[PDB]
Amino acid sequence: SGFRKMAFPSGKVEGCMVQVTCGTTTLNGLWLDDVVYCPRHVICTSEDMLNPNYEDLLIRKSNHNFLVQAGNVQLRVIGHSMQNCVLKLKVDTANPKTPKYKFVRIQPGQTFSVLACYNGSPSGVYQCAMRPNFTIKGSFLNGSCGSVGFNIDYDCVSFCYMHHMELPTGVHAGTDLEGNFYGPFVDRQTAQAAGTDTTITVNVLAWLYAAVINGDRWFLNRFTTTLNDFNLVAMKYNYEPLTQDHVDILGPLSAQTGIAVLDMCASLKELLQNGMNGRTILGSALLEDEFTPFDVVRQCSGVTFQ
Amino acid sequence: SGFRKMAFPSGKVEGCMVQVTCGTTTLNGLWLDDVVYCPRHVICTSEDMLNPNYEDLLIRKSNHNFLVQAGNVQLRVIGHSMQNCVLKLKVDTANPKTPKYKFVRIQPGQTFSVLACYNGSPSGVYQCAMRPNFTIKGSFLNGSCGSVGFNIDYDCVSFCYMHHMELPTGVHAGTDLEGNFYGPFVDRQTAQAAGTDTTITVNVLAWLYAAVINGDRWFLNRFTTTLNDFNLVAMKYNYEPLTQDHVDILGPLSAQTGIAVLDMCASLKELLQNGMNGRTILGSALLEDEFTPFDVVRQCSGVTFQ
Ligand SMILES: *[C@H](O)[C@H](C[C@@H]1CCNC1=O)NC(=O)[C@@H]1[C@@H]2[C@H](CN1C(=O)OC(c1ccc(F)cc1)c1ccc(F)cc1)C2(C)C
Ligand SMILES: *[C@H](O)[C@H](C[C@@H]1CCNC1=O)NC(=O)[C@@H]1[C@@H]2[C@H](CN1C(=O)OC(c1ccc(F)cc1)c1ccc(F)cc1)C2(C)C
């Protein structure tokens, strides 16, 4: 038993991390087969980053302007091209540690693991959710751009995120691995604001089911509610509306615990209207919304990856 | 910016994880050079695990009773011996992925990363603290024994923990890598209770400094307090006493923020006596105590590992 925010083992990604330097900018790249992927603002200087024209900037660059460091082994760049907001640096060596991988784009509400990196060297690993407003609440300092987010399915790494920037509220924005930003953001050093967020309702319910499975039961009750009446309360407390597909996704967790989904909604309603009265749930005094139903099933059942 | 519970990159440990099967028991082993380390209760059956005599049980075993699986490659056991509560299985192949390592024993209050494993395959990674009562609040299911806890210093892995068992309260107990239990526990399936816990005071203060560095300032105040007067309040709220060495350890974080250690103690005093009044600190509605001063400095400064 126990429930703990859990990242995927990072080994398969650690072997893809390299350092990319151009001029005065150093950041991380992702080395798969004979291509290194990295944020395109590596071609910029400081007075470039205020209002850059990246096509213009790139045509003035040379293969030899890009210094790629794979540990203490230098990789010669033999081609370069821009794909949306990422650079693709074609190198003369295929990464012998390339895992099976896919480039996927995730949905708000979904989680992934982040391998934070500096100077091409992994620093730590942690779990993040994509917020409804397409930001993530990460931990990123200068030099961390090019760190990636990912999920692992047996032996296949599904890369979903590359880090590019921090917004004024301290939250983080980036792209998928095809270089397309999550949310209405641009890779320019200007005033951009996140947009209003909401709480991921289906995830809170998943986490309540994780709590029951682990023996926290105090918030349960005999009451029930209809889906429509629950959603009237959700809107009040800035929670996302619950759909029948969410109810279906929660089916297995309902069946394991014997607590009907709409019954757990009645529990959530009471928690929203009353607070917790000084009690905790799975060691938290807040309703947690960054665990998906799959995250709960994986951890409360123990799936691995080889 | 941002502050997030962060594990070390797990790659160096992933390459040491193997599967050990004896009779009907399967668990994980740690393969370093030509030795596999694993919990000694792998030699047990169910009616062994109630009150086992492990010397007796081991003399009845054979090298060939131990099936060691390194992925899909079987390792022949050529010797076996017991060291306290761990088994050392001498195998005919040295692990070519053996990192530089040390076996260290940690202190309550210290943190480490856990690579949870099943059937020799890594499942997830997360950060844990050793509680003052020598338990850890982990996430472990059946088959997870032999998973290890560790810290990484540049390129050296300091193994500090091997998982053995879950207590009735849902917390977890295990040994150092020399097989000596943390706390007053034995590897027997009997009634053992954790012992009363306390809150790690120096870590809470470190986390308050992480909050200030990240812009949470509402809990600050002009008040101050003496170390003695703070400790009168700590004892009331079941917090550990603060020592001058804790104050010294917090010195660098004090200097960075310009907030004297004893001033932050006055803030903690107020938080203990008043609660939070519906506010949060670093996304938490509880005072968090599983970040060390070193964890805060590493993350709020960005140290890596190669
Ligand atoms: C890449 O390593 C870097 C990662 C940032 C640095 C701090 N935390 C991170 O996640 N990315 C950037 O520096 C990008 C890059 C420039 C600007 N930028 C950025 O993150 O935004 C900064 C900013 C400055 C002023 C504003 F009005 C808005 C945003 C920024 C924010 C915090 C901070 F500590 C430093 C810089 C661009 C987008 C090309
Ligand atoms: C090894 O994989 C296993 C890991 C445990 C299983 C569940 N969570 C874990 O961390 N370790 C054990 O099974 C050890 C092993 C037997 C008993 N044991 C154990 O964890 O304690 C169990 C227990 C049963 C009855 C009690 F009165 C106390 C303890 C236990 C607790 C929870 C659970 F789901 C299953 C079993 C020993 C110590 C040799």
Side-chain angles (χ1 to χ4, degrees), chain A residues 1-177 179-306, chain B residues 1-177 179-306:
Chain A
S1 72
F3 198 75
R4 181 70 70 191
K5 205 166 262 203
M6 206 166 300
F8 289 101
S10 59
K12 294 189 193 345
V13 183
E14 293 170 49
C16 303
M17 290 329 298
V18 307
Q19 185 179 211
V20 184
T21 293
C22 193
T24 193
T25 305
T26 304
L27 59 82
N28 305 278
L30 182 77
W31 180 24
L32 300 170
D33 298 319
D34 66 337
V35 177
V36 175
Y37 299 83
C38 74
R40 70 179 176 173
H41 75 258
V42 73
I43 62 172
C44 292
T45 64
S46 297
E47 63 274 17
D48 290 329
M49 290 186 196
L50 294 175
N51 206 5
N53 186 284
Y54 291 99
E55 182 177 2
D56 266 351
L57 297 175
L58 186 54
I59 187 69
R60 309 175 188 164
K61 319 296 315 292
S62 296
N63 282 344
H64 87 263
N65 298 135
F66 296 96
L67 312 191
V68 180
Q69 299 294 321
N72 47 24
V73 178
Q74 215 188 7
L75 299 186
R76 180 177 178 269
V77 174
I78 69 173
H80 62 273
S81 57
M82 186 157 71
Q83 175 145 0
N84 306 304
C85 296
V86 298
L87 260 187
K88 308 170 58 169
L89 300 183
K90 183 62 64 67
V91 299
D92 70 18
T93 304
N95 184 2
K97 293 185 286 186
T98 301
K100 183 178 183 292
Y101 71 92
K102 309 190 289 193
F103 288 169
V104 309
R105 186 176 173 100
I106 62 166
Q107 290 287 326
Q110 277 203 252
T111 53
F112 54 100
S113 298
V114 173
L115 177 68
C117 286
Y118 301 88
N119 316 107
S121 292
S123 180
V125 66
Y126 57 86
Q127 194 85 344
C128 283
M130 181 74 53
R131 300 311 307 175
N133 65 3
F134 293 100
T135 63
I136 71 174
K137 306 186 169 256
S139 173
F140 289 115
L141 305 167
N142 176 43
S144 72
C145 293
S147 306
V148 296
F150 61 98
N151 284 296
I152 301 184
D153 198 38
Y154 192 57
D155 61 348
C156 179
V157 178
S158 292
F159 294 105
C160 59
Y161 178 80
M162 185 154 284
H163 186 55
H164 290 244
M165 64 189 218
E166 171 167 322
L167 297 174
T169 52
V171 307
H172 300 103
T175 68
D176 69 15
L177 271 294
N180 304 290
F181 263 95
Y182 288 103
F185 310 113
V186 294
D187 53 344
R188 284 185 254 141
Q189 195 168 312
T190 78
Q192 310 171 69
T196 299
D197 213 19
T198 50
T199 296
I200 312 161
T201 304
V202 62
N203 285 4
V204 176
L205 297 166
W207 175 76
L208 289 180
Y209 278 111
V212 172
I213 293 171
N214 276 261
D216 286 343
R217 299 186 63 92
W218 60 264
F219 51 85
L220 296 176
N221 58 64
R222 67 188 268 168
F223 308 106
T224 191
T225 187
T226 65
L227 185 53
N228 295 320
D229 285 88
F230 174 73
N231 279 316
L232 289 181
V233 182
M235 186 178 289
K236 184 176 180 180
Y237 290 88
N238 191 27
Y239 270 51
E240 283 190 313
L242 205 66
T243 69
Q244 183 67 34
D245 191 54
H246 294 144
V247 171
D248 298 339
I249 289 147
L250 292 168
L253 283 176
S254 187
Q256 183 184 352
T257 58
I259 293 160
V261 172
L262 278 298
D263 291 352
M264 180 86 67
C265 287
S267 285
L268 183 45
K269 179 177 182 293
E270 293 302 307
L271 288 166
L272 289 169
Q273 288 172 353
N274 298 339
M276 292 206 189
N277 303 306
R279 292 161 281 181
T280 61
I281 301 184
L282 285 175
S284 177
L286 303 188
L287 297 176
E288 176 65 33
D289 81 338
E290 299 215 338
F291 296 99
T292 67
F294 168 102
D295 297 339
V296 173
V297 172
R298 161 171 73 113
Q299 193 173 154
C300 307
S301 177
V303 184
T304 58
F305 307 96
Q306 188 179 3
Chain B
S1 72
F3 198 75
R4 181 70 70 191
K5 205 166 262 203
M6 206 166 300
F8 289 101
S10 59
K12 294 189 193 345
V13 183
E14 293 170 49
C16 303
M17 290 329 298
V18 307
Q19 185 179 211
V20 184
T21 293
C22 193
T24 193
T25 305
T26 304
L27 59 82
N28 305 278
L30 182 77
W31 180 24
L32 300 170
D33 298 319
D34 66 337
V35 177
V36 175
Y37 299 83
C38 74
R40 70 179 176 173
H41 75 258
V42 73
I43 62 172
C44 292
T45 64
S46 297
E47 63 274 17
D48 290 329
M49 290 186 196
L50 294 175
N51 206 5
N53 186 284
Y54 291 99
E55 182 177 2
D56 266 351
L57 297 175
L58 186 54
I59 187 69
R60 309 175 188 164
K61 319 296 315 292
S62 296
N63 282 344
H64 87 263
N65 298 135
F66 296 96
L67 312 191
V68 180
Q69 299 294 321
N72 47 24
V73 178
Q74 215 188 7
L75 299 186
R76 180 177 178 269
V77 174
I78 69 173
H80 62 273
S81 57
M82 186 157 71
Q83 175 145 0
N84 306 304
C85 296
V86 298
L87 260 187
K88 308 170 58 169
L89 300 183
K90 183 62 64 67
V91 299
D92 70 18
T93 304
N95 184 2
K97 293 185 286 186
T98 301
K100 183 178 183 292
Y101 71 92
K102 309 190 289 193
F103 288 169
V104 309
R105 186 176 173 100
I106 62 166
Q107 290 287 326
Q110 277 203 252
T111 53
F112 54 100
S113 298
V114 173
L115 177 68
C117 286
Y118 301 88
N119 316 107
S121 292
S123 180
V125 66
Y126 57 86
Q127 194 85 344
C128 283
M130 181 74 53
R131 300 311 307 175
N133 65 3
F134 293 100
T135 63
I136 71 174
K137 306 186 169 256
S139 173
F140 289 115
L141 305 167
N142 176 43
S144 72
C145 293
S147 306
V148 296
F150 61 98
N151 284 296
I152 301 184
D153 198 38
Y154 192 57
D155 61 348
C156 179
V157 178
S158 292
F159 294 105
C160 59
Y161 178 80
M162 185 154 284
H163 186 55
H164 290 244
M165 64 189 218
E166 171 167 322
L167 297 174
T169 52
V171 307
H172 300 103
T175 68
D176 69 15
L177 271 294
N180 304 290
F181 263 95
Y182 288 103
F185 310 113
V186 294
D187 53 344
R188 284 185 254 141
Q189 195 168 312
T190 78
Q192 310 171 69
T196 299
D197 213 19
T198 50
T199 296
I200 312 161
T201 304
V202 62
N203 285 4
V204 176
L205 297 166
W207 175 76
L208 289 180
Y209 278 111
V212 172
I213 293 171
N214 276 261
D216 286 343
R217 299 186 63 92
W218 60 264
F219 51 85
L220 296 176
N221 58 64
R222 67 188 268 168
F223 308 106
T224 191
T225 187
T226 65
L227 185 53
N228 295 320
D229 285 88
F230 174 73
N231 279 316
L232 289 181
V233 182
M235 186 178 289
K236 184 176 180 180
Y237 290 88
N238 191 27
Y239 270 51
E240 283 190 313
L242 205 66
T243 69
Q244 183 67 34
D245 191 54
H246 294 144
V247 171
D248 298 339
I249 289 147
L250 292 168
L253 283 176
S254 187
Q256 183 184 352
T257 58
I259 293 160
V261 172
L262 278 298
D263 291 352
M264 180 86 67
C265 287
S267 285
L268 183 45
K269 179 177 182 293
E270 293 302 307
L271 288 166
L272 289 169
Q273 288 172 353
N274 298 339
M276 292 206 189
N277 303 306
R279 292 161 281 181
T280 61
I281 301 184
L282 285 175
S284 177
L286 303 188
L287 297 176
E288 176 65 33
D289 81 338
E290 299 215 338
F291 296 99
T292 67
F294 168 102
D295 297 339
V296 173
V297 172
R298 161 171 73 113
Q299 193 173 154
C300 307
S301 177
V303 184
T304 58
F305 307 96
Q306 188 179 3

